[PDB]
Amino acid sequence: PDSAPGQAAVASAYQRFEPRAYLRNNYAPPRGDLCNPNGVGPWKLRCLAQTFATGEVSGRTLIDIGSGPTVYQLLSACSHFEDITMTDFLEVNRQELGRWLQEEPGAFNWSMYSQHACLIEGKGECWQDKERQLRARVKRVLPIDVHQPQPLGAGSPAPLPADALVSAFCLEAVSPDLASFQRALDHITTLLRPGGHLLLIGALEESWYLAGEARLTVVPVSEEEVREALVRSGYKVRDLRTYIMPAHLQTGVDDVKGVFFAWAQKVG
Amino acid sequence: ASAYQRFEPRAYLRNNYAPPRGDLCNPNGVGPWKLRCLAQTFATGEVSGRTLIDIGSGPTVYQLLSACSHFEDITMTDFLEVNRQELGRWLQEEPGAFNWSMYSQHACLIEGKGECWQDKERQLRARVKRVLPIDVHQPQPLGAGSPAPLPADALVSAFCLEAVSPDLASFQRALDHITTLLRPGGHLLLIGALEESWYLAGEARLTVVPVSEEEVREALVRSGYKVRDLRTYIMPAHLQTGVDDVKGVFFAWAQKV
Ligand SMILES: Nc1ncnc2c1ncn2[C@@H]1O[C@H](CSCC[C@H](N)C(=O)O)[C@@H](O)[C@H]1O
Ligand SMILES: Nc1ncnc2c1ncn2[C@@H]1O[C@H](CSCC[C@H](N)C(=O)O)[C@@H](O)[C@H]1O
Numbered sequence A: 001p002d003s004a005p006g007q008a009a010v011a012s013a014y015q016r017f018e019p020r021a022y023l024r025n026n027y028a029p030p031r032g033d034l035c036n037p038n039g040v041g042p043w044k045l046r047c048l049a050q051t052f053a054t055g056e057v058s059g060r061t062l063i064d065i066g067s068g069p070t071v072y073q074l075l076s077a078c079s080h081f082e083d084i085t086m087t088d089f090l091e092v093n094r095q096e097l098g099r100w101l102q103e104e105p106g107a108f109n110w111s112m113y114s115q116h117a118c119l120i121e122g123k124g125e126c127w128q129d130k131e132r133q134l135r136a137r138v139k140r141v142l143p144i145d146v147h148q149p150q151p152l153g154a155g156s157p158a159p160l161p162a163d164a165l166v167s168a169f170c171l172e173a174v175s176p177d178l179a180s181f182q183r184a185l186d187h188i189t190t191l192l193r194p195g196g197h198l199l200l201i202g203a204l205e206e207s208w209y210l211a212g213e214a215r216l217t218v219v220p221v222s223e224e225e226v227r228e229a230l231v232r233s234g235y236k237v238r239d240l241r242t243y244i245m246p247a248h249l250q251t252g253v254d255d256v257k258g259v260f261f262a263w264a265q266k267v268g
Numbered sequence B: 001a002s003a004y005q006r007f008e009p010r011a012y013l014r015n016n017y018a019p020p021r022g023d024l025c026n027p028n029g030v031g032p033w034k035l036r037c038l039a040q041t042f043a044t045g046e047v048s049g050r051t052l053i054d055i056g057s058g059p060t061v062y063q064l065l066s067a068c069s070h071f072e073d074i075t076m077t078d079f080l081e082v083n084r085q086e087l088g089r090w091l092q093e094e095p096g097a098f099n100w101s102m103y104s105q106h107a108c109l110i111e112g113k114g115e116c117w118q119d120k121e122r123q124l125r126a127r128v129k130r131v132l133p134i135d136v137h138q139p140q141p142l143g144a145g146s147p148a149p150l151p152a153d154a155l156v157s158a159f160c161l162e163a164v165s166p167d168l169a170s171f172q173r174a175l176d177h178i179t180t181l182l183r184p185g186g187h188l189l190l191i192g193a194l195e196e197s198w199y200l201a202g203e204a205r206l207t208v209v210p211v212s213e214e215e216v217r218e219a220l221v222r223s224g225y226k227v228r229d230l231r232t233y234i235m236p237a238h239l240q241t242g243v244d245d246v247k248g249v250f251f252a253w254a255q256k257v
């Protein structure tokens, strides 16, 4: 009926979100181990690489929805878009990205991820070049709130509508329930042009994860709930695959059961 | 040969394996070309067996990155103790070891098997069983009671022979010597400088015999090899740095017969 309470709880909880702990929890080993091809990191990168490798997802502008403190989700993307917008709710995350953009030593090191992306893209690109291009193509880092009908605000800086959207582990991680999730998907969809593409990666059947002091409440979603929401938002689903989280990667940082990858094209 | 007593490993790694010659990003540089020759050759599946020996390793490992997944027993060698020490520092992940990761990465990249560079380094470190003294000017370069399994199924040698031979004849004889280490029907991957007469290694100034591709080809023949492949990389101007007067690099894939 009324979305304010749940959304308020969410915003409250994220005030405690610690980027460094979150990076360590999910992007340092064992989950950040890119050597095991059956690991989640390599699967995520592979979903992205293969999708962009079709040549079917291109344009001038791309918006990454809920970037947090991570850039891996753009490694394969960056060679297909001149203009990239990164976004996040939390200033601290936006500053994390700032540190990487300035190429500071105190910044999180993504070079393994950059290398791995070069590896599976199979074009013999060195990772320093991939990183240099991503840094050059990120044109802005913006506040965002997906619960707003205009997630970027009014008169945003972003080129709208975008040719493509990327969003990894955001919607389910900030929506108290499925209806909120659906509305969030509707909101970000207004930023995408008709015939444009959305690459959505997320947690399956997760109810909580840790980011330092912050223990965050997640709406657990299934593949089928994800498919239906995409259709409900005006997408044709081109691809929807599932990674089942291996027991050895269940580290107590969350109760994630799996990860989904969706390639969807906005009808129009 | 006394000149090699002033040879500084770090200065050599600096001159040849750090930028610009060590930049692997540009596909037209010497580093990537070398790795490609090695990778492509092994990818054929025709160079294989159980044991491999690297002749004149110096302080470098890149020349075995593609090799290591085809040979369970690897022997590295050099004339200088300091080079063997520098190798030991990398093989044992000791302090102040040279950083080869860029090369491991590129080998993984070129090979295209989706392998992470750490697994690659791990395997190489696991398969190098020993680092031995050696002198190619000796009829038995490894000495008599060598811990090395002989004959080897395959040899690798990069920038050693021409770099240690006053003249063509010495070069030919040294090739003769190392060839005795190789099992008949075995393979030799030989990489070397073309038309070079000197190079620097810190305080060391080394004399080199300037050799041509045809001269390299004829040497292998005269040593009893069938030349399966012989390619030339011409050294671009921007990689002419003042550390030597190398004109090009040759890669030769030869088979003892
Ligand atoms: N109301 C809201 N609207 C849009 N993004 C939000 C939000 N509340 C929290 N977020 C951001 O959602 C992110 C979830 S973490 C995922 C980060 C990154 N995309 C990855 O792939 O690892 C956090 O960065 C959080 O700050
Ligand atoms: N008389 C001799 N017999 C065998 N090796 C020798 C030698 N005199 C010097 N060497 C070794 O020959 C090497 C030349 S440079 C090292 C080349 C290295 N494998 C790479 O590819 O870059 C030096 O390590 C040097 O110590």
Ligand SMILES: O=C1Cc2ccc(Cl)cc2N1
Pocket: A026, A031, A040, A041, A044, A169, A173, A203, A206, A208, A209, A254, A256, A259
């Ligand atoms: O591999 C992934 C990365 C990631 C981010 C956030 C959450 Cl809740 C779960 C996972 N698992």
Ligand SMILES: O=C1Cc2ccc(Cl)cc2N1
Pocket: B016, B021, B030, B031, B159, B163, B193, B196, B199, B244, B246, B249
């Ligand atoms: O690229 C290469 C590597 C190398 C080793 C030794 C010498 Cl004398 C010259 C070169 N040039």
